[PDB]
Design an enzyme around this catalytic site. Structure first.
Site, short mmCIF file in Angstrom:
data_model
loop_
_atom_site.label_atom_id
_atom_site.label_comp_id
_atom_site.label_asym_id
_atom_site.label_seq_id
_atom_site.Cartn_x
_atom_site.Cartn_y
_atom_site.Cartn_z
CG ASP A 142 -9.09 -13.99 22.54
OD1 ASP A 142 -8.41 -13.07 22.87
OD2 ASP A 142 -10.57 -12.93 21.79
CG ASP A 191 -8.55 -9.13 24.92
OD1 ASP A 191 -8.10 -9.77 24.22
OD2 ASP A 191 -10.29 -8.46 25.28
CG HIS A 205 -14.02 -5.38 24.77
ND1 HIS A 205 -13.71 -5.52 23.60
CD2 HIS A 205 -13.62 -5.93 25.49
CE1 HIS A 205 -12.73 -6.78 23.95
NE2 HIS A 205 -12.79 -7.52 24.54
CG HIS A 208 -18.20 -4.78 27.13
ND1 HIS A 208 -18.44 -3.82 27.11
CD2 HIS A 208 -18.21 -5.33 26.26
CE1 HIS A 208 -19.01 -3.00 26.12
NE2 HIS A 208 -18.75 -4.09 25.14
CD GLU A 224 -13.01 -7.96 20.48
OE1 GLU A 224 -13.88 -7.85 20.61
OE2 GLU A 224 -12.02 -9.50 21.59
CD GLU A 279 -9.10 -8.11 21.65
OE1 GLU A 279 -9.01 -10.18 21.38
OE2 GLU A 279 -9.90 -7.52 22.51
CO CO Z 1 -11.98 -9.15 23.06
#
Ligand code: CO
Lengths: 52, 370, 65, 69, 61
Positions: free
Chosen positions: B143, B154, B223, B231, B256, B351
């Site tokens: 990640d 992300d 998120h 976030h 995610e 993700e």
């Molecule tokens: Co994340």
RNA sequence: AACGCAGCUAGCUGCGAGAAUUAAUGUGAAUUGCAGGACACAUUGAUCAUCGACACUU
RNA sequence: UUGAAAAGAACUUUGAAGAGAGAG
RNA sequence: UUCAAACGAGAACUUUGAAUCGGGUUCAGAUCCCCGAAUCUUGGAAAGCGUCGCGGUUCCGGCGGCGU
């Protein structure tokens, strides 16, 4: 006592002690202020314990 | 416009000097309007007009996603068992830095590269002196994120070497894709949690002669991403029974999805490495000179983005985790220690960052790999 | 918002009584941000906190008599 | 502290093994030569400038010299 | 990796103190981890390392 | 009688700087509020009980 | 002295909360 | 006792303003910590204290000008 504290820290962390000041906390534990010799430094030493 | 070298070194903007960057997968919003399809906004009405009003914002996400794609292809190219993840993280970070051509906060890494092994789930990166050699019978969650002027993307995937994990990988990938397609405009987060749980649980895993059932990690969730804010305050769940908040036009989300052959919950196990300054806290007095110095260093260099202790040692700062925990107690920075499941369990994560365009839904992080 | 601590510290630093300590009425935010004697010494140099003059008690009336 | 009154004594007490440093203080009307010994801080005061430099050339080598001014 | 009483009984005296010494040394480090931020896995190690102290010290006594 | 001893522990309880226990024997997969730690269970071992070895601060 | 079993009331809504109204 | 403002969902009552010695040091410890000295002049002006300025704005805990 102050003498016993000084010897213990020296052989435990391989440093030199100038003076030690102790007091008994209100909770009943004894707190000791151990001052190192000028040639040693507390910064790098306290890294070795991992505290600093 | 030049081309990229075999070991990726050319910055993405050099590959697209025109300024327009490759678009993600454009997808029409789900026909959740009681059968009526949403294929009425793709026409170039005022919806498209106000979509054009934010075109420059999207292009940053596009270049960040392209950089992420090249970085992860490069990582997939040479990743192999037997080498520790300290050099793996160094290679990933330096390649991403060269591809994004970071300069202060206008461009750079969004958060430290997480590489969680086995039962560990997220928010783990090796620290200084971490001697962990990779094994053939390991699973890793890569990640990492990049940003352009704060437009964070992300994305995360899972790497395996033993072919006994492909069932779990395909289960988690299907769950993530189902969450992707289920997401949309004016839809409740509990609905996406419903969909993710109903797709992911219908899979069975056979590992080492023991049959396990793959279950979501109810503790983690997706998120929403904000301007320099990873976030944004909205969490899309991956289990049933969540909030009834809707997703609105003009927002971006990280969908995610975690799956474990364990208990479905995580806790703090090992030393914390990820840290994050609070976006909401204001001015809090500090009494230690070292603490003040570290605080101003981090707010100059990392701003509100997440950082790790490797990134601080990379800056030449030492004897600092003290003042770091001091900022933690003062509430300026929140530690994010690794989340791990029961020992002997295995966790997989996939993700993607999605865009809620006025006319369509673009998954900018989509690539040919996954 | 709460400046009880800063007035006590200012009096100790200024070596005067709390009645002689003046806090800026429309700058209250960053004195409220001061929580150490160092930060108090920051403000008294910038003029945000100053020592009010001693109340006048002239002896001229008694001197004349 | 002790006052050294005549020049010859000062360079002697500066040559003692316990003498750690000498500090030279430059005033408007005089220069003070203070040597830190084990038990006392000896001070020699000369009221005229020209002798200050010539004595300053004649400190024993290796003894730490601090200039206050 | 697990200290057990019966295997230590035939072991000689000198290195038993050597075995005692480091176990005390790790115990000191664990106490350092407790006062600072400490991992739960780390905080599980005091009880086991303490019992090995008793296990070893019981042997010599 | 006092004072201490638990990862998170104030009281009760148990224990004594080897400090909610060491060793040994029996038993045989748990303890549990959470986490962690366990756990070939004989190339011999969690827990509990028993208790003869050791230890037991003022 | 809840309950066989916490299954100890998700979620929505008013209120700053204590408190409610639905729901379970 | 009054007026105004701030925070605050809410203000007669909260906060701000107006009617073996010397020197430093904390949020809370100083004859105990640090520095320096020991058991008229040296100490001593370098300190400290007044004012006038320059830097810095959680960094500089940095600089100087006069006077004592
Ligand atoms: Co994340």
């Amino acid at each position: 006592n102050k003498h016993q504290i000084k010897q213990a820290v020296k052989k435990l962390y391989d440093i030199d002690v100038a003076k030690v000041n102790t007091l008994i906390r209100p909770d009943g534990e004894k707190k000791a202020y151990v001052r190192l010799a000028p040639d040693y430094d507390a910064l790098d030493v306290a890294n070795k314990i991992g505290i600093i | 416009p030049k081309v990229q070298t075999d070991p990726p070194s050319v910055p993405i903007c050099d590959l697209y000097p025109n300024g327009v960057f490759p678009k993600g997968q454009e997808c029409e919003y789900p026909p959740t309007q009681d059968g009526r399809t949403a294929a009425w906004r793709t026409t170039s009405e005022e919806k498209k007009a106000l979509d054009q009003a934010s075109e420059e914002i999207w292009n940053d996400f596009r270049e960040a996603a392209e950089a992420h794609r090249q970085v992860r292809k490069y990582v997939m190219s040479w990743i192999k068992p037997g080498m520790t993840m300290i050099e793996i993280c160094e290679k990933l970070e330096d390649c991403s830095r060269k591809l994004i051509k970071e300069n202060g906060l206008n461009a750079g890494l969004a958060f430290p590269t997480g590489c969680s092994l086995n039962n560990c789930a997220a928010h783990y990166t090796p620290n200084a002196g971490d001697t962990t050699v990779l094994q053939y019978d390991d699973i890793c969650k890569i990640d990492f994120g990049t940003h352009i002027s704060g437009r964070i993307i992300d994305c995360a995937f899972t790497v395996t070497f033993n072919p006994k994990y492909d069932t779990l990988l395909k289960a988690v990938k299907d769950a993530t894709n189902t969450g992707i397609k289920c997401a949309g405009i004016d839809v409740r987060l509990c609905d996406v949690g419903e969909a993710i749980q109903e797709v992911m649980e219908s899979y069975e895993v056979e590992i080492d002669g023991k049959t396990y059932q793959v279950k979501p990690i109810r503790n983690l969730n997706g998120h929403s991403i904000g301007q320099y804010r990873i976030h944004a305050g909205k969490t899309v769940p991956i289990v049933k029974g969540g909030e009834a908040t809707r997703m609105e036009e003009g927002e971006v989300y990280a969908i995610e999805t975690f799956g474990s052959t364990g208990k479905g919950v995580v806790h703090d196990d090992m030393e914390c490495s990820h840290y994050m300054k609070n976006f909401d806290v204001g001015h809090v007095p500090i009494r230690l000179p070292r603490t003040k110095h570290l605080l101003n260093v981090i707010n100059e260099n990392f701003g509100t983005l997440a950082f790790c202790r490797r990134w601080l040692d990379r800056l030449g700062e030492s004897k600092y985790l003290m003042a770091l925990k001091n900022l933690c107690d003062l509430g300026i920075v929140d530690p994010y220690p690794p989340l791990c499941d029961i020992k002997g369990s295995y966790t997989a994560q996939f993700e993607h960052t999605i865009l809620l365009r006025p006319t369509c839904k673009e998954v900018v992080s989509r690539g040919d790999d996954y | 918002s709460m400046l009880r601590l800063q007035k006590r510290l200012a009096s100790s630093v200024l070596r005067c009584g709390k009645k002689k300590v003046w806090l800026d009425p429309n700058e209250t935010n960053e004195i409220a941000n001061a929580n150490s004697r160092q930060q108090i010494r920051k403000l008294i140099k910038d003029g945000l906190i100053i020592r009010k003059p001693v109340t006048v008690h002239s002896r001229a009336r008694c001197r004349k008599n | 502290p002790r006052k050294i009154e005549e020049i010859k004594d000062f360079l002697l007490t500066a040559r003692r093994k316990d003498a750690k440093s000498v500090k030279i203080k430059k005033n408007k009307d005089n220069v003070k030569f203070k040597v830190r010994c084990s038990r006392y801080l000896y001070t020699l005061v000369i009221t005229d400038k020209e002798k200050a430099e010539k004595l300053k050339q004649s400190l024993p080598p290796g003894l730490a010299v601090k200039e206050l001014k | 990796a697990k200290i057990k009483a019966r295997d230590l009984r035939g072991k000689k005296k000198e290195e038993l103190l050597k075995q005692l010494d480091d176990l005390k040394v790790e115990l000191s480090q664990l106490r350092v981890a407790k006062v600072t931020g400490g991992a739960a896995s780390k905080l599980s190690k005091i009880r086991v390392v303490r019992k090995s102290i008793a296990r070893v010290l019981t042997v010599i006594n």
